[PDB]
Write a protein that binds this ligand. Structure first.
Ligand code: HEB
Length: 106
């Protein structure tokens, strides 16, 4: 697993989701960013490389992907209900966390 790979992968999928056409395509794209965000959880970013083992940064780090993983769970549900549209609208939330974390964390 590599975080730089995870990051390109989340963006590849986020692009597909915004552009998506079918429920199944949004859904699978969300699954792929879910797998990459999961691997992101145990990758080592250079930006939070050297934080302490017992600190308010290692937990808060993964929370960036954790928000995403939870919103993905809902967005899976929605896409499966045939809400292609609400699954794309949820991409604004994952994307808001992309940038919100990225304003300090990347
Ligand atoms: C939201 C789902 C999200 C997206 C789409 C995203 C995309 C990227 C891209 C394309 C990069 C560039 C790769 C690089 O220059 O290193 C990138 C880098 C990093 N990201 Fe993210 N990111 C998203 C979401 C998050 C969340 C949430 C993060 C915080 C937990 C987060 C962190 C990082 C980090 C640390 C990097 C830099 C990696 C490095 O090796 O320096 N990203 N992201």
């Amino acid at each position: 697993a590599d975080l730089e790979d995870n990051m390109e992968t989340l963006n590849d999928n986020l692009k597909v989701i915004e552009k998506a056409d079918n429920a199944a395509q949004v859904k699978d794209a969300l699954t792929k960013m879910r797998a990459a965000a999961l691997d992101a959880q145990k990758a080592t970013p250079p930006k939070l490389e050297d934080k302490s083992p017992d600190s308010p940064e290692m937990k808060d780090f993964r929370h960036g992907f954790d928000i995403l993983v939870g919103q993905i769970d809902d967005a899976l549900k929605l896409a499966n209900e045939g809400k292609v549209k609400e699954a794309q609208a949820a991409a604004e939330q994952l994307k808001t966390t992309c940038n919100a974390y990225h304003q300090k964390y990347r």
